[PDB]
């Protein structure tokens, strides 16, 4: 069933009274930053109510439900929500005896699964006052509910506007909602603390408020960065100047000439980098983004002050959330990242931030370098408008994302790379050279952009697998790795094919 706001003093009144006989909450958090907002202002609440609450860090479906198993009729659990997942897929089937446990589901996937929204023991929450999924496109952000939640029940605290803030610029960073529907979020938080709007040029030093939105030039972390590498690494900007081409540092370092800016202001640190140096670059860039069609890079920007630094907006907030949370060695996994990025978004000092904004920088690095690469040089192929195709066997390249958390960054890259490239979105496969194992390892990755195609992919992917006797390593949500021997290179394509051509 839809639980919309005339329902939530019902529903809190529930989790009150359950919580008095010493039972638990169970909260399911899916891998992204605006589930770990949602997750942070849910607790806050449950903390000033005493209520006992725990988080379980879900990659997958197969994950939610053995875990789901082991704790149903085995502790204290009474009520159990399902964060940015769930909402699509049939609840039930997946799940069985449900029926004891208060079961509610914030998730931001459109449309509900019919059976999900007909069975009266599934809570569909939404803000309103009035494995396959279902999944089309991308709504409210899950963080967003849960201030509605606080709002409607006059426990709202100001800091959840910030958190909410990160939720939303995680959606867009994420490519799950567009610039207008990010504008509208901004608004709404607006309207309800009372801000105005404060100019580009502003920089921050004079507002009393602890909060404040300001018009901004959405380069990646460029306050955190360099004007030369937060230009070249921001992907959407980059692909319209076309400075990823071959030769592209050449063609780019022209641009960077081309605003009267000498490569010693450049590449110094943005925050010391003289004003006006600032200035030309900001009209140089209005200019170019009626040019080259980019207008969305200037958005609001909402800010949080952190001591007597204003430098950190909720955009840099989610690049760095979602860098932190980001498997990038062996031992990191969602289980342990969870809890990383839910302490840096509980931060209120600004120091901890500058690791989120080095990881990020560090990655982006990597796999803009490389990815260039192998869009210019690489076997990548366009195979029946289904998938993108690349294997790299190049000794350097493949030795250094041959493990899947690597290899699935890089996939990710090029799978938005390529996109952009050719103004055609479509999933994408990668094989890396194990050249020790004698292996290629295989990831499958499909962006958010392609929800709508996402149960195919991951149908016939997994049945390519099954087909060939290879083993699903890993999946996620969005994401599957495999791996086969070398001199099946040719086979495994040719299967792949014919399965996505079923
Ligand atoms: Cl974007
Ligand atoms: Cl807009
Ligand atoms: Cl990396």
Redesign the pocket.
């Known amino acids: 069933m839809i639980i919309n706001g005339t329902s939530f003093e019902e529903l809190y009144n529930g989790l009150r009274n359950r919580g008095k006989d010493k039972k638990t909450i169970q909260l399911y958090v899916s891998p992204t930053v605006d589930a770990i907002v949602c997750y942070k202002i849910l607790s806050m609440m449950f903390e000033k109510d005493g209520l006992l609450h725990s988080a379980v860090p879900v990659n997958n479906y197969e994950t939610l439900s053995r875990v789901f198993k082991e704790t149903i009729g085995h502790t204290d659990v009474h009520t159990v929500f399902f964060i940015d997942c769930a909402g699509s897929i049939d609840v039930s089937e997946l799940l069985g005896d449900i029926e004891n446990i208060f079961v509610y589901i914030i998730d931001s996937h459109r449309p509900f699964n019919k059976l999900n929204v007909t069975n009266t023991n599934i809570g569909l929450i939404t803000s309103n006052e009035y494995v396959d999924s279902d999944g089309e496109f991308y709504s409210e952000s899950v963080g967003r509910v849960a201030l509605a939640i606080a709002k409607k029940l006059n426990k709202v605290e100001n800091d959840m506007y910030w958190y909410a803030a990160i939720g939303v610029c995680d959606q867009y960073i994420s490519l799950k909602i567009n610039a207008k529907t990010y504008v509208h979020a901004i608004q709404y938080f607006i309207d309800n603390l009372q801000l105005e709007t404060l100019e580009i040029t502003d920089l921050l030093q004079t507002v009393k408020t602890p909060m404040c939105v300001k018009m901004d030039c959405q380069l990646m972390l460029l306050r955190h960065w360099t004007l030369y590498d937060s230009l070249f690494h921001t992907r959407e900007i980059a692909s319209k100047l076309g400075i990823w081409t071959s030769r592209g540092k050449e063609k780019f370092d022209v641009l960077i000439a081309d605003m009267g800016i000498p490569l010693s202001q450049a590449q110094q640190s943005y925050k010391t980098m003289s004003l006006e140096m600032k200035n030309k670059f900001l009209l140089k860039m209005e200019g170019y983004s009626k040019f080259y069609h980019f207008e969305n890079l200037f958005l609001p920007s909402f800010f949080k002050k952190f001591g007597m630094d204003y430098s950190i907006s909720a955009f840099d907030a989610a690049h760095a959330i979602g860098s932190i949370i980001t498997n990038?060695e062996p031992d990191q996994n969602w289980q342990q990242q969870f809890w990383e990025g839910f302490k840096l978004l509980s931060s209120t000092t600004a120091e901890p931030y500058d690791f989120g904004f080095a990881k990020c920088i560090?990655?982006n690095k990597?796999?803009v370098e490389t990815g260039i690469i192998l869009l210019l040089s690489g076997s990548c192929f366009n195979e029946a408008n289904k998938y993108r195709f690349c294997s790299v066997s190049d000794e350097l390249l493949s030795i250094r994302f041959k493990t899947p958390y690597?290899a699935l960054?890089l996939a990710q890259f090029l799978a938005e790379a390529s996109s952009r490239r050719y103004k055609k979105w479509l999933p994408f496969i990668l094989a890396v050279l194990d050249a020790e194992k004698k292996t290629f390892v295989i990831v499958g990755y499909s962006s958010p952009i392609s929800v709508k195609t996402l149960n195919y992919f991951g149908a016939k992917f997994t049945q390519t697998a099954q087909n060939m006797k290879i083993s699903i390593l890993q999946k996620s949500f969005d994401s599957f790795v495999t791996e086969i021997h070398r001199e099946n290179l040719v086979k495994y394509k040719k299967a792949l094919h014919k399965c996505f051509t079923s």
């Open positions: 990038d560090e990655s990597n796999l690597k960054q």
